[PDB]
């Protein structure tokens, strides 16, 4: 009668969450539905040489390329590759870290077969590195807080302040500072940058905002793998805090 | 300090090696798709003189803006905003706390993004408490089953993993293959991508807007994710 109580709390949290997300997104979806219907009607009015069926075929052809991983915006020939050494390193890192953006996913049958075996053997391999970093860093943090405890209201209270301090430092070095960097590089708003860092470091990875390629502009080949190194050190910093607490 | 660094090197090598394999598997398809879409855009402008090349890009961007928000720009829908209703927002809420994040439907408003940060920060550890609670109660049942076998150990452990791959991996994939209309590989690919909380979003259960789904189907899939995530957690911990 303890796990069932937790299950009820979780179901209630999903129903409550569903009610809040519905009220926040229903007016925007209705406005976007009305907007796109008007933009299609006005395009045909402004371009008399385009038939209504020819417009739909163009849209579906652009969506066919977009779903495959190729953005139909701008000159595709001039655009960089989503599967070059740098981008495929970030795709590999995206699989083993269970973030799964889903923006540049495998389309070929061979790519799907290798992706199953890559996640099955790569996710536990990454977990061994993530735990190894967290246990080595938890030892350093354990030694630093034991030195603070030796100097000193409550022995439990002095450990909570240290925990808050570790979270605050991590939220500046791995959350605040990187979000400022993404805001300038990608051209996202301040809200979108924090939203991206939270969605990424929590391994949710929606894919609505992706560190690299979120524009038809040419991104450097060294920028995208460096973002994975931020993901590695960010995921690992919070793992050492939870290992120290436990 | 010469053990974690060795693991780090193995992981980096695994990413470089993985990147080389994925590049060889997907580079010919990406090149073909890039050539295809560039030709379709050039032919549209050749057939429609009255359309400027910039006016074409603006139309594409506008269609993609609606598509990413959840509204398909193909044809016309209605007040059927079934992407953010009580049923779909319940699955989106599940998509967040389980860290799967399909991202087929995501928050667009600023308020929706603010609530999503606080929903994941307080919901992911809440789901983790249920996932650990199920796994510890499940591990006790496993322990009692393996102690009964020992009274009559690696083979038994392998048998308990093979049972999970049939009940939670093989059987569900067969059901999705017929219902959704996916190929045998796509079904296994979906189950692996889902149970490993990767959630790309390329294949979503109950996502094909053209299928008249029965009411008992979509909530049954989320029950499978819940009971499968605990059994799959024991496999990844053993590995």
């Amino acid at each position, epitope marked *: 009668k303890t796990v069932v109580a937790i299950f009820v709390v979780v179901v209630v949290y999903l129903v409550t969450g569903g009610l809040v997300f519905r009220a926040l997104e229903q007016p925007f979806e209705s*406005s976007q539905k009305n*907007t796109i219907a*008007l*933009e299609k009607a*006005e395009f045909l*009015r402004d371009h008399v040489c385009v038939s209504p069926q020819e417009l739909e075929t163009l849209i579906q052809h652009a969506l066919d390329a977009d779903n495959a991983g190729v953005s139909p*915006i*701008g000159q595709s020939s001039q655009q960089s590759s989503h599967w070059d050494l740098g981008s495929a390193f970030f795709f590999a890192g995206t699989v083993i870290t269970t973030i799964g953006y889903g923006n540049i996913a495998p389309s070929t049958e061979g790519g799907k077969i290798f992706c199953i075996l890559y996640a099955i053997f790569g996710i536990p391999l990454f977990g061994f590195l993530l735990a190894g970093i967290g246990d080595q860093l938890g030892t350093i943090f354990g030694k630093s807080i034991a030195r603070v405890e030796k100097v000193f209201v409550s022995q439990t209270k002095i450990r909570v302040i240290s925990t808050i301090l570790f979270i605050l430092a991590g939220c500046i070095v791995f959350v605040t500072i990187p979000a400022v960097i993404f*805001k*300038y590089i*990608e*051209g*996202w*708003t301040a809200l*979108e940058s924090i939203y991206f860092v939270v969605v990424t470091l929590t391994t949710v990875g929606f894919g609505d905002f992706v560190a690299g390629g*979120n*524009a*038809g*502009i040419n991104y450097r080949e060294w920028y995208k793998p460096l973002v994975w190194f931020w993901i590695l050190v960010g995921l690992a910093y919070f793992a050492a805090v939870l290992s120290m607490i436990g | 300090m010469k053990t974690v660094v060795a693991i780090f090197v193995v992981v980096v090598v695994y990413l470089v090696t993985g990147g080389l394999v994925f590049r060889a598997l997907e580079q010919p398809f990406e090149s073909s798709q890039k050539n295809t879409i560039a030709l379709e855009k050039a032919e549209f402008l050749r057939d429609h003189v009255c359309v400027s090349p*910039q006016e074409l*890009e*603006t139309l594409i*961007q*506008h269609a993609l*803006d609606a598509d990413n928000a959840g509204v398909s720009p193909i044809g016309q829908s209605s007040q059927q905003s079934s992407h953010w209703d009580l049923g779909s927002a319940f699955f989106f809420a599940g998509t967040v706390i389980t860290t799967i994040g399909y991202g087929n439907i995501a928050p667009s408003t*600023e308020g929706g993004k603010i609530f999503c940060i606080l929903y994941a920060i307080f919901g992911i550890p809440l789901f983790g408490f249920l996932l650990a609670g199920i796994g510890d109660q499940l591990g006790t049942i496993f322990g009692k089953s393996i102690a009964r076998v020992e009274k009559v150990r690696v083979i038994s452990t392998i048998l308990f993993i093979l049972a999970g791959c049939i009940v939670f991996v093989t059987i569900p994939a067969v059901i999705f293959k017929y219902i959704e209309g996916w190929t045998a590989l796509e079904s296994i690919y979906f189950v692996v991508v889902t149970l490993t909380t990767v959630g790309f979003g390329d294949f979503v259960a109950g996502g094909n807007a053209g299928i008249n789904y029965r009411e008992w189907y979509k909530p049954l899939v989320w029950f499978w994710i819940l009971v499968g995530l605990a059994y799959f957690a024991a496999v990844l911990s053993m590995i």
Partner: nanobody
Amino acid sequence: VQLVESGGGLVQAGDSLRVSCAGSGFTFTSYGMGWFRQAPGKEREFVASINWNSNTAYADSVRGRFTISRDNAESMMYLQMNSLKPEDTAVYYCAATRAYSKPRVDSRHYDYWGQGTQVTV
């Protein structure tokens, strides 16, 4: 650092007029700019917006009539206003955002602003 508007005139109802906004002292291609307006006795209202390339976004009151555009080679932005109504007579200010990914619509996100140009219908 500086935004300059030009094209404010007096026009008849149901007629077309185009106003221009030129950027100076900053990298034009890295800033997503847009238009805003303010009629006498009313608060500031959104008009049009564009990203670094060709993604536009308009207010529900001016879609299908107004057209925002940019020519990065000439470091300029244009707003072609068609079939101008007597409800469009306002001071039009052009503003720019360091966040270029999508066409921003909230005035809070726009950093640099213009002096305004009076279009009277």
